[model samples]
Target chain A: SKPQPIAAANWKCNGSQQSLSELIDLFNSTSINHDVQCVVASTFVHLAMTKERLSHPKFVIAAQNAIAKSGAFTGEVSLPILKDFGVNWIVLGHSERRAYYGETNEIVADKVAAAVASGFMVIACIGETLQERESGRTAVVVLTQIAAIAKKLKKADWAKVVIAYEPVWAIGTGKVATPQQAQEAHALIRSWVSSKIGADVAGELRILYGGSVNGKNARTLYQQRDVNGFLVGGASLKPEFVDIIKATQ
Target chain B: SKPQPIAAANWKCNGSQQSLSELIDLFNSTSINHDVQCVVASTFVHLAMTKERLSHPKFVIAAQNAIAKSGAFTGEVSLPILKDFGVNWIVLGHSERRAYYGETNEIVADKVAAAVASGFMVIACIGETLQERESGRTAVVVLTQIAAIAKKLKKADWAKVVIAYEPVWAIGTGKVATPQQAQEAHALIRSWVSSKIGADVAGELRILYGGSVNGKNARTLYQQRDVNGFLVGGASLKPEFVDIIKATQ
Candidate 1:
């Protein structure tokens, strides 16, 4: 069977409870026939509200981030608690955390290991800055982030991990990579997984392109050989997320 | 009338849903008299859970931190959403956010203004580092943080703002400010407010001494003239939180 496509709408810090309810109603009314899996990552405060409103078998919720473990970290959410709240998916190692919040590769790896250990599916994020990519370390940087997780988890855990490659320069700036550029990066990540893990696991893994993903570009990027799906950010806040989901169908 | 004593429990990244429920149950069972006001600042994920479980008239829930405003800041909780969840208090500019998360004083001030505008009571945290204190810049550092917020908010907003003096060196290291030392810092903050806003507003403000506030030291610190309450960190997670609450009674 072909790898099932996965798309997550990361509302990030947007929406009050009322606004989130409207967004969920919009999603539920929209027809989704695609075999593609859909997830929504919302603000911590809105998670329960979203869970309560958007409780469909096809739709699920993920935390934008979570603590490595449960306890004493003040101001952080634990993986176990996210699980208890019915959040099965979590986004780890996003570039925003790396730049603004000082999340290092090692720390992201530890969080990924813990989230997986606590029975949450992981959307393990990897990316490099313009400077790093210009310095010809794109593969080196992306692989190093992935390698950190491989060092912590066993081969079977690979099935629960979806790699999201969001180039730092492109994220939130509206400067998306061209289709070819995305394909090359996705192919490189897939090859890295084949070499580090086994080819079977790498081939089965779903690699998603995340920087500036939207309705217009989703079709081309979805057609890429190695690009299995998308991790939509800004556009995910709108009905455009539904459009992207339907495009996958 | 005397200013209402504002006691805040900073449950820094501690407790699961089960443990938090038990703590809330204990708090509801114990009588927190009308003179003393209590609030718990929980991790972002637990804020809603805390709000749902703890509905006592004397007790309120607060977010440990909030992004200055709403929308797509990724991995942050917004003040507007906090309001939607009935979270009426927010802590901005804690030493941990400053030292670990790179929250500059200016950004903290912006957050305070946003929290105020969103109608959440603000625990505007300000304190000096050990080095700053040693260099005779404690008042300077503290004033700079408070002055920024004072510029944005009017004198009437002072009642909604609780000032927490959490000296960086003393936090979590078990080295607490001596009673005289705390008194002096609290007095300086009150005087600064009096000088900036007016004597009446300053007299009506509550200055809480936060660093290393435990059951043993609660009385001595609470006895200080301007030291109205605490932003208890580690102790807030224990049965000792109740003891600290009763100490003020």
Candidate 2:
């Protein structure tokens, strides 16, 4: 079976209720590819409002991040709460968390396990910083993260896991990854899964590229062999987001 | 005129849309004393929803925190944006932010200045940790924080400022400050303000006692000459919170 195309918008800590409502209405009216799956990861506060406005079989809402579980964790959203809000997906282990909040690979793996247990389809972000790539540890770092999750999850869970390879240097810097850079990272992730999780599961997995993806670079990155789709950032805020959705058509 | 009592709820990342609406409904139904001003500080995501539901002269909604100004700061709420939502109050220099996110006293002072300049009332939180108290530097630490903000603002801005003295050790811990302990800190803050700003402004300013303030301790703390009211935390989540209001009445 061919890999299904997936595109997600991560509107991190941006947009007020009015603007969010406008964004959702814009998305609902715009034409999008029926074959490509569309999702939006919003702040926990806006999740329910977005879910209410965009509850369709084609469009789904995701939490930008969630606590591993519920109860007594201040300043953290819970998985069960997200589940109750009609959120079906979550993005975990993004570079910003690692860089700003001291999130380690171990914590990422723990979050992945918790999210999966709560029945959320996970977009597990794995990437290398410019420093790590400069030191030739890009493959080592990315593979270690994959291996940690693979150790806990079974082959069946791989179907629900979408690997998003985002280079830390390109995130929010307006510098996008070249198609070659994105293709290399995606291919490496797929090859690692094939070796560790088995060939059949690897063949069916969707590997996405996520650093500063926009309408301009969406087509070239989508053309890569292992690059299945994109996990969009700032560009997701505009009507141009709908243009990126059409790229996969 | 006697000082008006101030009560604030720090709802730290703890409610969904349904739960928040339910909580707000409960808040609106319960009759509150007109003499007691009520405020709820919610996480960035829920601020808008809370604003839409909360409509009363005595009741107001505040953002948990906000950036000093609007342009180019990511993952931060801005005062102007908050103002647009009918949010008039902001809590600055909370210990959780200082300890968890590396927010320095100088940075918090800058935020307070900005919020005041932008016409938002400021709930400025200041307190000493267990070590600082044991070292006999509690007054020094608290005064230092006050001086930072006082240096940036004019005497007229004192009315818009509500001082929240929350000892770091007592917050979220079942261990609360004894009436004597709270009075000592509250009086010291009052003295520092009188010496620096003036006796008239200091007497008129509202200073709130925070850190685990509840119905049981609230009665005694409210009896202190200098301690005006509370910035309630966990107790704010319960109906018993109204008991504190009645006690003051």
Candidate 3:
């Protein structure tokens, strides 16, 4: 079976009611491939506002990130709460979370276990920083991240996970990795899953390349056998994000 | 002249539309003390919902806490955005935020300065932990926190800031400080403000006591010469929270 294509927007500390409505309105007006499942991993603050405006069938909402625990974690939204509020997915372990906040591999792993148990379809992201990539530790770094989450999850949990490989050096730098670079990384990720689980499971899993993901490069990246979709950042805020989803067509 | 009593609800990381509606109905259905300026500092995720259902003149919405920065601090809701969303107040440096997240005194000070500049009323919370209090460092810990904001502010900014003294030892520990303990701490904070700013400003500044504040003791605590209000936590989720507000009446 072929991997299903997905395009999720991590609007990331951006968008207000005006921009949110505009984004949803544009999405409603534009038609995209039904093959690509579209999600807006929005700012948790205005998710209610987003839900109010999101009439488009192509789009669903994901919490940008969530806390690993329940209650008394002031200002932190948890997965159980987001689920009740109609959030269909969660994007966890984005590189920004790893770099800025102290989201260690173990922490992300714990969140993954809990989110999986809660039955959320998770965009569980993992990637290596520029320094790690420079030292040829990309595979080791990504492998370690996956291994932590792997140990936490049951084999059945893999069915609800989407792997996003966002290379830190390329993120927000307007530096598109060569398709070969993305493909190699994606293939490596699949190979690890294949080793841990089975080839069939690895083959069907969607691996998205995030990092300066613009529409022009989206098709080229997705065309690679191992690259199933994109977890977009900067472009995700613009009308061009709509174009990136269409690139899958 | 006495300070106008203010009782704010820090709902922490709890509530959904279903429960929020129930809360709002209860609040709208109940008449609070007209003298009390009440605010509901909600999880940023639910501020809009809280705003939508609020009909009480005493109640306005507040962001539980916010990032002290602007732009690209993924998952952080900035002060400017909060203003745009109609949040009348923001609870800063809540003990939970200080301990769980890396909201250092300096970082919180910056946010306080910026939030005040943007004209948002701020609940600038400070407190001593069980260890610090047991070691006789309560005044030192609490004063040092106030000083950070003092360093960042013009004298005028103090007008919009409320000092919340949440003794960490008492919070959620079922350890409500004795009324004398609460009053002494409140008086010490006022003295620091009086010395740092001026007597009139200190006299006018509203000082709130938080930590296991309940309806039964609320009147006794609020009747203190210096304890202006309560920042009710768990009780804020119940009908008795309204009683705490009325205790000032």
Candidate 4:
């Protein structure tokens, strides 16, 4: 069987009980493409409520971030606590965490390894800043990010990890990679996996295109061979997120 | 009337639904000293449940940390989101955040200003590492941390702020500041406030001693004129937390 495509909504520092309840209502009222594994990353405060309200098998709750270990790290969520809340997926190393919170590639990799080791799946994010991309260092940048995770993870660990390629230049800035641009990046990533990791792993690893992915543009990107799905940002908070998920069908 | 003494519990990256529910049960079963303003800082994942489960006039829920501003800061909880969850107090600049997460004095100060600006009370933590204390730079180090917050906050903002003096050497290390040692540091902090931020504000601001404060040691520290209360760590997670709160009686 082919790997399932994914549509992840990173609410990222957003959501309240009132707003999230409504979103959960919309999710319950609509039918999602069974071919797509739909995930919503709510703020830590709303995880419990989101889990109980959005009780669909195809949908899962994801924590936006968690610390590499559990203990003495004040203000940080540990994997065990997230797991206790029935959250099985964590969105690790989003560009926002890297740029704003000083999450180095090494730190992100530590998180990915810890999440997988603790029996959780991860939406492991990687992308280059516009400066790096414009300077023709995009592949080197993202590959370095991937290599860090590879060093920390065993071959089998890749089964629990899905990579989200979110270009920093495009994220929240309204710019998006064209279908060809996205496919090129996705293909390069998959090729790197095949050469470095193994062909079997590459064939199974699903790479989701993130950054400015909307309902309208979702279809074009869906057609890309390596573009398995999306990690939708702003669109994820709207009614049209249903439409974006439908594009996967 | 004297500014109410505060006994705050900083749960610091700990607690699960099961563990927290039991703690909440313990809190509810006991009667606390009404004179002290009791606060419990739980991990973000447990805040809502803590708020809902431990409902009492004297008990208030606090978030362990929040970013200075909201928007696109993935994995970070924002002030408004916390507020929506009925969180009125925030514990800012805990030593763990300073030591492990690269939260500098400036970053912590930004958080204090933001929390106060958003109409929330703050437990502003300041402490010196072992090296700084051994090298006799304790006063300079702690004052520097205070100066950062003083720079961002107005004289009026001091009303919403409580200072927590947690010696880095003592936190989570089983070692503790002797009662005299804690009083001396708390005195210096209060003195600094008197000369620099204004005596009226100093008189009003509550400075709580933190650093392995347990039930046995709580009374001696409470006798100190400057030691208003405590920010208990490990003890806060246990039944003896009641005894610690009783010390204020």
Candidate 5:
């Protein structure tokens, strides 16, 4: 059985009310491939409005992040709160958060567990830095990150989770992973899931390729056997985001 | 010339759509003291809904936390985004953020500068931990925190700033700073601002007492000369939040 292709636009700390209305209209007017699952993620501040303005049924709204639980952690959006705002999808452990905000793999795993427990879908991010890739430790580094989640999650929880592999060096650097690199990494991740979690779960899991994924490169990347879809960044904010979604077809 | 009293409710990772509507309506119907400025803050997911539903001239909407600036930082709400949501008041450097999220004085100072530079009023929180207070380092600990902000801002920026002194020991512990302790801390903070920034600036700055501040203690706390207002927590979510505001009268 083929996993459904997903194209998620992560606005990533960007978007304004006026511009969002325009973008929402643009997305609503554009036709998306029926087989491709389309998602739009905005900062927490814009999630409610984005959910309200984005009228297309196929377009799902995601929060860029959410806390592990609903509690006294000030300045954080809780999963329950996100759910109340019509945001069922949460993007956790983005490379930017991991690098800039000091989110440890343990922390991301805790969030994944919490999001799943609260009945929300999660795009759990994992990636290796340029140094790790250059040092030939990409496989070890990424697996370690995944292993953190695997240890914390029940085997059934994998159904609610999507893994996004974003290379730190490629993110926002305009240095996209080649189709071959994306496929190889996806295959490596799937193979690990097969061996550790279960072969059936690996087959069913949707492994996304992120970092510098623009429309021009989307089709080629989507051609990979294990490359399920994308967690797009900068290009997600542009008109070409529709092109990337179409590429999933 | 008395500084206008401010009563800001730090929802602190709390509230839902249904309850928030009720709270908003309650606040709208209640008559607030003319001199007291009221504020209600909710989780980021609720801020948009909160601002739209909360209609009162004396009331302001605040974000519990925000990034210093906008861009590429995934999952962070920016100061501009807060302003776009009609959130003019930003609560930065809360003891929770400082203790849990690893927000240093330097980081909080940077956020204060950014919020002020972006034309948003700031409720800049400063505090000392139980250990620091027990060791008699409360003066130095909080003063050092203030000095970080003083070094970063010009004298004029102080006009848009409100200081919140939430001793870490008292926050959420049901133990609050007594009147004498609260006034002493407030006076010490104002003195530091006067010496380091300017006497006039210090005189004009509003120092808010936080940490378990409720309707019961509001009047006595408000009676202190240096304790101009409050940054309320738990009570702000209740009907009695009105009492805290009325205490300013």
Candidate 6:
């Protein structure tokens, strides 16, 4: 059997207390399926407000990003704090974070290990830039990131991890990798996991494509063999997000 | 006349939902004078909970850090969002933030400008590291940070800014900056403000000392002409914080 689909939205540095209520209203009315996982990764400030406003058992909350370490890391939140707020998931290593916040693959790997240990599922993101892809180093870049993470986690920890592939060129640029391109990258990620862990664990792990994902394009990407879900950006804030979430159906 | 003293607490990377309730009990029970302002800066995760916990009118909620700008800066909180959550005060720079998190004088300046624009009072921190102090570059480092912040704001905007002098050498090192040392730094900062803005604004601005500021040494520090108040750290989480906040009285 295939792994369950994960539709995760990173609200990014957007959303006020008021806007979240509107998004929650859309999610509240949208009937969510039990088999597919629906989660939203919000800014640290919005985590509590979203937790209070949203009313749904099927949908869970995630912190958009958190530092893997604790104490004296001012301006950073930790996994322990997120768990206490009832957040069951975290979106880590988004390209925005990697490029802007100095979140190297090693740092993201540290966060992944910590998030999993502290009782939160991590949607670990990885991908290549247009330059890297053009240079034909996409596999090299993405594989190194995976290797960094695989070295950190035990075999049992993979259950708590979902991988999201986001090409730097595609993010916020509206230049998504083609369906075939996404499938190839996702399959490569799964194979890397299989080699690092085992075929059984690799088969069970979910891999999502997260570059310019929208409702119109989601069905095409989700139909691919190894593409299990999405890590949505802009489309996640709109009513159209419901269409994307239901694409797997 | 000196600006009203402000006792700002940076809870740093500590506090949980439960521990906050305990801390709130102390704030609620402690009597606050009208002349002195008291506030607490906390981890982003605790702001909402802390707002709900503390009932004292004099004590308010502040975020320890926020991004200077908005948009798709993942895992970072923006000033607009903080302002929406009823957080009017933001701790823009601390030794911990400036040292560990790549918060340079330029970056912290950006945050100070963004926070003031969003109607937040900025507790802008500047300090010299241990090595910088030993090398006699204390004033150079501190003034460089101040100059950057000054270049961004109109003279009138200084009313929304308070300088926190947290000598990196003194932070958590158990080496409290002597009252004379603290006052000298504060005086130099006040004169810099005088030059950047005006004598009136400089006289009106509050410059706080943040190091290993605990209950024992607070009143002596607060009594100095230039040492306006404190930006407390570890003591903030303990019952001793009550004594420090009341030091002005």
CAPRI docking class of candidate 1: medium
Stretches off by above 4 angstroms in model 2 are A16-18, A69-75, A148-156, A171-176, B16-22, B68-81, B151-157
Which candidate has the highest DockQ of all? 4
- The number of clashing residue pairs in each candidate reads 3, 0, 0, 0, 0, 0
Worst 10 residues of 2 chain B by lDDT: B68-77
Pitting candidate 3 against candidate 5, the one with the higher lDDT is 5
* Global CA lDDT computed for model 4: 0.88
Candidate 6, residue A74: Cα displacement in angstroms equals: 2.0
Taken in order, the candidates have interface RMSDs of 1.8, 3.9, 1.4, 1.1, 1.2, 1.2
lDDT of each: 0.82, 0.80, 0.84, 0.88, 0.86, 0.85
Question: What would the DockQ be for model 4?
Answer: 0.83
Tell me which residue pairs clash in candidate 6.
none
> Tens-digit lDDT track for model 6 on B109-171?
888998888889889998888888889998998889899889889987888999988878876
TM-score of chain B of each: 0.94, 0.95, 0.96, 0.96, 0.95, 0.96
lDDT, residue B238, model 5: 91
* Tens digits of per-residue lDDT for model 5, B114-149: 989998889999988887888989988998999998
Q: Write the per-residue lDDT of candidate 1 for residues B1-249, one digit (tens) a residue.
A: 447887789887766778888999988888766578898888877777887788778888788888866665678877777777777888888887787678888888788888787777888888888778889999898888888878888767776788988877665566657889888888898889888789888888888888777788898777778788888888988888877887675
Q: TM-score for all predictions?
A: 0.91, 0.89, 0.97, 0.97, 0.97, 0.97
Worst 10 residues of 4 chain A by lDDT: A27-36
In lDDT terms, which candidate is top? 4
Off by over 4 Å in 3: B172-176
Which residue pairs in candidate 3 collide? Answer: none
By lDDT rank, best first, the candidates go 4, 5, 6, 3, 1, 2
- The DockQ for candidate 6, computed on C-alphas, is 0.78
Per-residue lDDT for B1-249 in model 4, tens only? 447899899888888789889988988888764677999999988877887799766788898999865578889999999888889999989988898778899999899999999999999999998889889999999999999989998888899999999988665565657888888888899899999988899889899988777888788788888888899888888988899999886
Off by over 4 Å in 4: B172-176
Per-residue CA lDDT of candidate 2, range B15-102, in tens?
6778778778878887775688888887656765787887656778877777765433323456766776677888888887788666
TM-score of model 3's chain A: 0.97
